[PDB]
Design a binder for this molecule. Structure first.
Ligand SMILES: CC(C)(CO)[C@@H](O)C(=O)NCCC(=O)O
Ligand SMILES: CC(C)(CO)[C@@H](O)C(=O)NCCC(=O)O
Lengths: 248, 248
């Protein structure tokens, strides 16, 4: 048939919940991850969002980078659907994990790499702009490692909290060479600066491994889409990876 | 004669205290800026550092980017030396402050620009790697603005505090193209990445304003100085600016 699957991406700030019946088209919602949430709270939040679809869920797949939240997801799955979730984790098989300790790679990164190898090919560079911005390298189906940078909001917030004089600035690219006020200075340093950082890391990768395609994803990616050269834009990459890992 | 001046740079993290008798050579110490410090606490910390030099101080000049600390510095100056400090601020003179609100430019940046125009020339790009990393552009003795980036430690700390799984990583450049564990991923993204960000911003400035000399300074600059192209490395730049502004 076409059984419905619930896919979950538990991030540090937000958790994405998505339903699919084919692994190709997805309906998507986002909630704050939030401290001390319970399984009943999760159900209550999802109830008016999923509506009728709720009763059709046959399997639950989860990538999580917030271990304290995992018991809540497990309890929600068991209480409301009488099933245990399937947890995305690096394992041998379809991807070779050529790093020091694959078990420590974030589940969202694993999902991104799995989705890339299933849908796009054996060679690529994945940029995921979220709470942190990750760069992930896959070469001939081997995960090679990558980079982790603070995310855009994380950066503006760090400048605000970590100094006396700086305000909290809205994340918006600079369309000028030098900023002429404090907000412009920070936009240029954080937004354009982070794009330059990524271009530098990607450039050096390409020098060593050749000209790989770049996929861009993440909840913070849409605002800088025009600024970074990329061959694929796919906002659903992580959720696709959860689907492929858990439900093939 | 050669009156001794005390120069102070009050940063968000550290406060630099420096004495000079000629504005050419400087002895320096660094303390934490530390919350709720009093004038007597400051004297107590400085006493074994300055020793006999303390009694010789004829003037006190200060750049501060922590307004709450200013009353302590003022009271210290008045109580122990019966003088008021001279406060670095943007004003007309040797520098034209070509930005929207020059009164909002950080006093450390002001000091850097003043020092540059006094010692090095009328055209340059100043990179000051401190709590935040600042880029400052001076063209024909006109301050044109710049960029503000989170500093290196600010970045690694933000990743640690802002995520569940990431550790606090020591700031050390990456000598690899992709990281093969978490710590390596963070070093590449934060340290190498910030250098790339700076090179990008500098490069874009140079496209518009021409090939200007780059000066590096700041408490976090030494670790990365071999990674960034620069023509001048001067760790005393801010203190020099305090001296030039206050005492000529
Ligand atoms: C980097 C983040 C925070 C991105 O969400 C996450 O993938 C994570 O917690 N990773 C664990 C460390 C690693 O991937 O090396
Ligand atoms: C950017 C910092 C924090 C660097 O110390 C400082 O110069 C500052 O508080 N500046 C005020 C904002 C500005 O310079 O536009």
């Amino acid at each position: 048939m076409d059984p419905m699957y619930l896919l979950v991406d538990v991030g540090n700030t937000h958790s994405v919940f998505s339903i699919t019946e084919d692994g190709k088209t997805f309906r998507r919602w986002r909630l704050s991850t939030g401290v001390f949430q319970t399984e009943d709270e999760l159900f209550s939040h999802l109830h008016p969002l999923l509506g009728d679809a709720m009763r059709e869920i046959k399997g639950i797949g989860v990538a999580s980078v917030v271990p304290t939240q995992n018991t809540v997801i497990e309890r929600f799955s068991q209480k409301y659907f009488h099933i245990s979730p399937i947890w995305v984790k690096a394992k041998n098989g379809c991807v070779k994990w050529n790093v020091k300790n694959p078990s420590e790679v974030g589940a969202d990164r694993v999902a991104n790499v799995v989705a890339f190898v299933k849908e796009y090919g054996k060679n690529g560079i994945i940029i995921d702009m979220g709470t942190a911005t990750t760069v992930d390298l896959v070469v001939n189906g081997s995960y090679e490692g990558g980079a982790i940078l603070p995310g855009f909001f994380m950066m503006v917030h760090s400048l605000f909290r970590g100094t006396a004089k700086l305000p909290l600035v809205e994340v918006k690219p600079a369309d000028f060479v030098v900023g002429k006020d404090t907000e412009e200075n920070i936009r240029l340093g954080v937004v354009n600066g982070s794009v330059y950082a990524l271009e530098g890391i990607i450039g050096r990768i390409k020098e060593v491994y050749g000209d790989l395609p770049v996929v861009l994803t993440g909840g913070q990616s849409k605002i800088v889409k025009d600024m970074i050269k990329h061959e694929i834009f796919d906002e659903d990459l992580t959720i696709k990876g959860v689907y492929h890992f858990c439900f093939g």
